[model samples]
Every structure is written in structure tokens, then in C-alpha cells.
Target chain A: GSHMKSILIEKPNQLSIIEREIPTPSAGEVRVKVKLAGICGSDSHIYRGHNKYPRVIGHEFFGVIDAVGEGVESARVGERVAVDPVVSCGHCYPCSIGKPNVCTTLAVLGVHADGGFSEYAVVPAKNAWKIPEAVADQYAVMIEPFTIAANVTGHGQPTENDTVLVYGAGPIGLTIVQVLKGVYNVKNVIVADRIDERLEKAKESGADWAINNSQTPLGESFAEKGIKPTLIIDAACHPSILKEAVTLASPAARIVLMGFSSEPSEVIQQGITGKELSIFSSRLNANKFPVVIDWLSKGLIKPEKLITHTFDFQHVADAISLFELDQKHCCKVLLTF
Target chain B: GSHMKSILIEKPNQLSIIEREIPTPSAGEVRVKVKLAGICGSDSHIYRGHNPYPRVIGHEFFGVIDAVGEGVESARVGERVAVDPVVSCGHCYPCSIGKPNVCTTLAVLGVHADGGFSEYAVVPAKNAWKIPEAVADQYAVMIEPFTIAANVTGHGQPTENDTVLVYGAGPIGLTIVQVLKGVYNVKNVIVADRIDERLEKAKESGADWAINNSQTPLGESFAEKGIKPTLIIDAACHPSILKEAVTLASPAARIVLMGFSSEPSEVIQQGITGKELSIFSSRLNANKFPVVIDWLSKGLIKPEKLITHTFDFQHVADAISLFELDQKHCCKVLLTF
Candidate 1:
């Protein structure tokens, strides 16, 4: 009886490690033994009944291939890889135009299918992007998130001359700070967050200045610092941040939204058109995994630095609880199998 | 004392036809004897005190040069010209990037200073673009709005394959339909409005389909028609249109906002990020006046078709009243001197 124990959500706030038959890899698919997984914001939503139940939810994970199906290269069986969870329908409009992240029929390895919260997860072999030899499993677990940062930075097309203003000091925001500084050579990185400790994490990463929006208005601080950001990133996903970005953005600025919000957001029409701003949002990473691996090898991005807490996969329930309970205290929490 | 008769806005709802000293052309500038002037939405805003007043209020106008300042070409005296109302600083962030329309310290002819509403309007000589003989002054008076339509369409980067959805069938929206169809060769132009008459005007102007949003929900009609729009233009300036555009846009659709709304707008974040939509906005025409004149000359865009009524410059008060009173009937009201 070939079976494995995988953490699945039976209902809201209900987590279970149940025995299920190990899925054999089909043609062009590979079965990877999960080693490390990250708990993302979406996982919290799925656990809170926002998503349908009886689903194993884990989209950001890295592991080694244990099995490969027909048509998949056998040499991939033992490769240490970071799986890109996005599964795009090749013929979709977005996919055809090199925007697979927004493909109409996009499926994710973990959320829409059996993802890496299990002992063994089967995915398309093409999604199993190999991690660099210099990067250990601890840092490799962040490949997915780093790819997201890469895509976001690419959208803004930041350069060394750009003064970047990033909203959010959470994991994604901190990663954006690092990528803009370390990868893109952007010198002036200003990170804004309500939590002072989270701002400290951003400073540790690469932020030149961190502003607490609750204490002082962004415009006031911007005036004080004489900082006019040409590129703005909203990783906080708060509806109010959109308005703030509109007010603080430099003329012709590119505003990138990475955080997800379900509620409606508003901004003055003149706020956007007056400055001729381009407010766009990025979906999943498209063909960015390879560049992320190269960055990891070159030590341009140190993803493990954002990790503040780690737990054994056996204690999945506890890991999610702690991460959700203390927002300011936790930067990123990873689960190691 | 040399004097000129001009239509001026003394204050909110206060119209004046008074005598003022004719402004002499400055260095590299010219005095234009206004022949045709069209009232714009912002002109109404100025009239309602949403903008500063005690100024001549007309930006969309065409006339012949009556006087030329020092270092100006005297040969341009008799040329029929459509003036680009925007005055850029040439060194600001927007101007340096070739987007002078959003330039800081930007001034418009009628709104900020003495505009074409006066008998003699003084502007930078370079701002006056000569219209082709093929295009009459009637069509040339619409050069500014058509250039705005051109810039908005360019921002969306619509291709021949794209199905365009435009919200609003007002003068600006109807002009957008004609520009998209006649210039861009976009065949499926879906124009929406509350008034059936305006919708009919949109249909006559080359809109393949017109939807009255008041009678039927755009979503329901979209489903009924099995129409999925790849490009959406928000010319309505309504706060709610943002949400509707988000709901109906195809994946990776480009949403261009050309209308100006002073109020805050709200839309579900997924409406933007879920589809990875690119929501951009255009200000005024940026190097598009010449193209608009070309389109008008080539018969690709018929701006005169939107004109519904005309009045003598002496009867500016009557024209403004009629244009504002029956919003359902009047499209473009022209004041000729």
C-alpha cells in the first residue's frame, strides 16, 4: 500500500494530516519529495474558509525529485529543485502573449491541485526549476517568492537612478527592497509600514529609510526627506495604500501592486491622470524562476535572511497559528519536512 | 486704448462678455483671432467653481494668427491653426521624458490664462499647429479632443485584433469610437451610455454596438452578446466605471482612463490583479495634435460629426446654459466669432 501523510484542510480552521495514496507521476510529470514549504497569505485565507475545503494548500515549496513519469527526463529524478507552482494553459491569451501568470485557466501546484504540503507531490516536470548549488534548501524554499519579487521589479523597470518607495514591510516588501537594492542597484529604497519592528526588518534588508504611516503622513515625511520616488511598489495590498501611492508617486511613476485585496479601493481620478501614472498589478511569475536561481547562485538575493521562524512539517497547525497571531513579530515562517 | 471683446468667467456661474486690453504677443509668441471655440467639461468645472476663475475659458479652438511677436515667422499670419493648449516647462520630470502634457507648472490657455474664448488669444507660436486645407475649421476645432482620444488609444496600445469597450457616449466617448474605428481599424467598438440618443450618436459615429447601461447591466449584456473585450476605455469619468471595467475586462486587458474624476473610486482588487490588468491613464495630448489633424484631413476621424449646436460668441451665456441643461441632447456646442 503506497501512501503518504499530507496536511489537508477539511473545513475552516480545521487542519489534518491524512493518509492518501501516493500519486504516481503521469507523462511529463515528476513526483517530488517535499522538504521545505512556506506558509503564504493565501494559505491563511484557505484555512479561514475563503477557499473550498478538503484541499491540500501549499504553493510555495522546494524539494527533490523522487520519481519522473514517461516523457520526463530521467536525469531529473535526483535534482534538487524549487517548484514554480503556476500551471498555465499554453493556448490562453495571456499565455500566448508571455503572460502565463494571468492565464485564463491557470492552475497552481498547491492551491488548485495537490501541492507541496505533502510528503510527495506530483507536478509538471517543467515547473521543477533546479536550485543553484550554492543555495541550500533553507534559501531555496524562497525561490517562488523571489520570482514574484523579480516579476514585480521587472514591471516597474527600476534602475539605479530610481528612488523607490515600497509600501509594506512584510516578507514580500522586504524581498522587494532587497531585489531593488541588490539586483537592480537602486540606491534609495524607502519602505513604509505601521509596525516599527517590521520596518527594522526592511532596514536590515536594504531600505534606506522606513516610515511609519500611522505616526507621520507619507507626504509630510516625503517633504522632510525630499524624497520623490519614481517607482512605487504596494506589497501591503491595503486599499488605502493605493491612494497614498497616488499622492506620493513622482510624475509618470509606475505603481506596482503585489498584495491581494478583496475589498474595493479608491483614488481621485486626477490623482492618476494628472501625473499620467501607470498603475498595474503583477500576477504569478512567468519565466522568472531561472533568473532567480542565477541571482541566488550569485548571492545577489539572500532570501533566507527574511526567515524569522521555522517549524517541522509535522507541526503545520502550530506554524500557521503563530504566523497569523503575531503579524509584527513574524517576518516569514517556513515548514521543514 | 486697444481693447478686445472676450467671454470670461468672473466667478462660479458668473459669465461675462467684457472688454479687456488685448494682450500683445510676447517673444516667440503670436496673437490668434479666435474663429471657433468649443466648450469642454473643464470649462463647465471652471464655471461651477471647481476650478479657479476670472479667466477666459476655452482650450479647444482654431483660429488664424492676427499678430506675430519678434523672432516669429510672419509667413504664418494667414495659416489656420489648431492650438495645443498645454504649455510645458521643458525641464520638468514629465517634459524631460517627452510627456509634456503632464508637466509640472503646466498651464492651459483658457483655464489658467487668457484662452481662445477671447477675441484675441496670445500663445507660444510653436503651440499653434497649422491644419491641412482638406480639414475645415469646423473639424479642426476638435483637434484637441481628438488628440486626447489619440493619446488614450495609444496608451492602451490597441491592435486590429482587439475588441474595444468604451464607457460613455458623450462627445469624448463618441470621438473615441470614431478614432478607434477610423484610425486604429478597431471594428468592434462597444460604446455605453445612459441616454439612448447619445448611444445612437455613438452608433452613427461607427460604434458597432451600443449598450445603454441604465436599461441593462453591462455584465448581462456582455454575457448575452458573448463579448469579451480586450481593451477598455473609461471616458465616462464615473467612479463606479472602474469596478465595472474590472468585472468585464478580459484577462490581461488594458483599461485606459481618459476622463477626469475628482472623487475617489473603489474597485475589488481582484478586478485588477486577478486578471493582471494594466490600468493606465492619459492626461492631455502629447505630440498627438499633428496626428489628429492628419486623421481629420484623411477623413479617418470626423470630429465635426459630434457637434450638435452652434452659437455666436456674443451668446456664450445661452450656449453654456443649453449645453448644461439638456445633458441628454447636446453633444458639442460650438461658439463662433
Candidate 2:
């Protein structure tokens, strides 16, 4: 069959890799052979067929440019590029103001539409931004995760004096630690996660300290020890941990929320008033992927090591199922074609 | 009667200015001969036995330095001064920040204890921050209200280019109109009130336009002339008027609430997210009395003509009773001793 293999959601209940006709690149489309794909919790939503199916799922990936259609002058054949998953209509008011996440016509590339899942994928020139020529294709895929971390830390613009506290020590959290320390020259990053292995990963990612919140109750003990966290990143999306973080934050503290939550989490509103704390919910990256590319070009981000397990293209379903089971200590799982 | 001839709120029904014992100025205190005592709306709240009752009410006034206690330097006898009603503890953190309104140990002159209702009132030397030598005592009385206007308008520092819409036509509203037009050079002031007489007075004061909400809503016709209010002062404490003010305000509009509501008010939460408006409550002024006094010394405020009616010390009861009946026609009634 001339058609390429694509993990497509045909209906609400099922997801399968079907042999589809090779997509013809339109006037400004760039055809890419996806070399690496990171399976996210968001992809889990898509694979469950519960994410209003009929779309492809893998987000945050690196690929080799196989073909470039007309009108795409910057990108060329045989170039390695990372696709920015967050897409926006260029004419929206939010886009005009340089805040595209809240754009009226914002559409997530992987979640709302087909993303880098198939052996070959077609993306608009605007949707697929370029990476540095020096970056390898494998590490380029993880730049999207680096962008997520960059969004949280970059919005606050952590100086060398700022003490960072990331709630979840997952790929995004670890990336924040690595990028802020290696690129931004941040002094300290205190990480918290329920999983011990993820916390260990954060420690290895150049974090000054990592704590599992499951064992110890965080009270005034942290502040007394001079670990007064001035910046907190709520990447865990756990209500239980946010309660602790809110209480433990220092005066003039800042919070950048990157993770998803359904219920309204508890925060010390009185502390917000008393300490004059500023809380920000960073919806998505604002110019992060390009900066992440620059950092990648400089070797500041180490996303390849953040990838704990890589499965062959044949074992994509098993990899997703294992992720669904939540049995593995993996920080991030990559699916390769 | 040997009792001092001071305006006294003896329970709910009775009022008299019998000769009560004259106050002896303690160390670091001064006594001002009550020259022109302005009756405020807060006095009515106190007289109605609404909150805590059985107290002397008038806080705002200006008079000659009749006497001064020992150890009070700079606060000499016969020195004219505008009283800062808020007596803050110099030790508090808010005091250190120069925002003494939020000071933990704040003691308001009228609300906490004795105020300027008597023939003479005593206050701390620090609270009696001096007025200019050239200014009259009548202009000095305007300092309290002018300080409030300064506090509300200080957030944006509305210049001649800015348009101000004050929501209440009370004493505070009138004062804001005067200050904005006379000193700050605000281009246009649109005042809204339920009373026709007060709106007319607002126009007379300095407002370019005044609207009585009962007839044609100022909020409704504000944008018809291509002017969306950039700043709002809620001096009327009218809950009905402010929601429309919020609706009529521009995206960056700042609504300053100087009045307190008796009950909790529900506002459209989506307006906060949609318009990105900020709501500020001028709970108290933050050390603006000296600046207000300076403005007064330069002949900035004309509060004398605002005295619509005057009552002698004997007729103070009738003046207080008139407030119970005609709050609209009553601009400002002063009880002269």
C-alpha cells in the first residue's frame, strides 16, 4: 500500500493505525516524516476516544522535512524541525496583542486536530516553526515540553535571585529545572511530586532540592529552614498539594499554573492579600518554542534524557496502555516510527 | 449648665450642646476651638443608632490653634493645621510602607473615640499636620474630603486628557469634581446622582456634565457622545449605579469605591475576565492631608459655597433631623459654635 501508517481515531470508542492515502502537500504545506513522538496525558484523552474523537493524537514531536510545498520559502527538504502544538488564527485579537493562547480562534494541533502521529504529516508553514540546524531530530521533539516549562518560568522571567518551586517533577517540571538552571542561570529550584522517581529525576535535572510531598507535611518548617520559595509552579494539578504550596509560599510570592484542573483548588487568599502575592495561570507558551530552539541550539535543554522509555512504532498501543495503567516510573514515554 | 457647649449625641432621641467640661490637652496634644463644624453623612449613621451609638460624631474640621500641650514642638499655639482623621501607629508595617490605611493599629479620630463635635477637640500632634500660613480656616475644613479625592484619583493620576465619571454627588463627589477640574486638569467630569438638586450642584462645582439617574441615566447616555469613562468614583455607595458604571467603563477603567455597602453585592465575575477592569476601594486615605492642605492653600478648593444651610449650636438638633428628612436637598449643613 502506498498509504502511510497513521494512528487515527475513527469513532468515539476506538483508535487504530489505518493505511491512509499519502496526503498531497497543498500550496503552503510542509510534508514531514515524524521521527519521534511524546505521548502525553492529553494524548491519553485522545486515545480513550473520550476527547471527542476523529483526530490524531501525539503532541510535542521532532521530524525530518521530506518535502516542502510552494509558498514555504524558509523550510527546505532534509531539515529537522519541531512542530509547535499550540496553534492560533493569526488575525485574532489575542494574537494581535501577542497573547495567542487566549486567542478567540485558538486550536490545539494534536488535541483538536491530527498531529505528528503518522509516518508522514502535513502542517502549515505557520503551524510548524523551525529549529536550529545543529539540533538532532530526537532532542528536537522534546523542545515542545521545554516550551511548556519555558512558558511557566519565562512569563515570570525568573532572575538569578529567584527561588523556583515546581509542583510536579514530570517532564515539564524537570525541563523547567534544567532550563532555568542551565540557560536562565537561576540559583535554586525546589521540586515536589508524589512520585519518588520523578522527584529524583528533578534532582538530576540540576534542581537544588527535590521533595516528595507524600511523606512529609509541609508547614512552617520549610520557611524556617530558609527555603522560602518566592516562585511556585503548580504543574501537578493536584488540589492537595496546592493547599500546601499556597500556605508555604513566601511574601510577594508568585504562582504560575501550567497543569489542568477541574475543581477550584484552595489557595490562601488572605496570604495573597497580606503578602501581596501575584498568581498567574499560564495557559500556553507565548514565544516559547522559538526560545526553546535557541536554547536547544545552545545545548541548554536536555529533553532526550527526560525521555524515560522509548517504544518502537509497533508497540505504540502497548506504550499508551502502559501509560494508562500508570504502572511505570517513566517521566515521559516516546513513540518512534 | 457647667457642661461644655459641645455637640453631643446622647443616645438615639436626644441631642444637645450643653456646657460639658472643656478637654485638657494631654502631652503631645492640641485643642482647636470649633470654628466651622461640617456635618457629614457618617454622623447620620452614628445618630441613627445604626452601628455603635451614644458618641460624638464630627471628625472633619479646621480651626485656630486655641491651645497646645507641653512637649509639642512645631505644633505651637495659633498654628493652623488640617487634622488627619486616621491616627496610625508608627510601628506598623503599612505605616512603614507609607500606606497607613492598612495599619494594624489604626485609630480613627471619630469612629474610635472623640472627634471635632465639641467647642474644642484634642488630637495628637502627629495627626494635626500643619496647613499653610496663608490659608483660611474654611479652606482647611475641605482637607478631609480633598484627601479622599486625592486617594481615589491617585491610582491613575488622571491628567487633562482623561475623562472622570464620579458616581455619587455627595460631599465626596463634589470634592472630587472640584479637585479634578481645579488642580488635576481632568478634561471632563460626568457626575451621576439620583437627586436633581445635587446633580445641579455637581454641575455648578466643576462637572462638565451631570446626570440624574431617575430621569435619564448618566450611565445610559455616557457613550452616546463618544466618551467611555476611563475612571469612576463610587462616592454615592449606590450598588445599582456601579454595575452600569462597570459596564460603561473602558477595558482599563479603574472604579474607586469610597463608600461602604450595608450588604454584600454580587457582580458579574465574567466582567473581570472579559473587560480586565480593576475595582479599588478607597477604604481610607493614605497620608494625603498635607498635599490636600497645599492644594487648599493655593485656593484650589471652594468648599464655602457648598454650605447650603447653616444651623447654630442650639439648632444642631433641627439640622440633624433635617438629614433624616431631606438628604437630597441637603448639600452640607454646618453647626457653628
Winning candidate number (lDDT): 1
- TM-score of each model's B chain? 0.97, 0.91
- Give me the candidate number with maximum TM-score: 1
Note the residue pairs that clash in candidate 1: A266-B265
Docking class of 2: incorrect
Off by over 4 Å in 1: A48-50, A326-329, B327-329
Q: Once superposed on the true structure, which residue ranges of model 2 sit more than 4 Å away at CA? A: A1-337, B1-3, B12-14, B215-227, B240-243
Taking the tens digit of each residue's C-alpha lDDT, what string does model 1 give over B39-138?
A: 8888888887885358889999999998999999889898899899998889977787788888888898887777898888999998999988878888
- Every candidate's DockQ is 0.66, 0.10
Q: Model 2, range B173-247, lDDT digits (tens) per residue?
A: 898898889888888888988888888889889999888777776645765786677777778875455466666
lDDT (Cα, tens digit) per residue for candidate 2, span A20-85:
887767887788888888888778776665435678777777787788888877438777778877
Worst 10 residues of 1 chain A by lDDT: A258-267
Model 1 captures what fraction of native contacts?
0.82
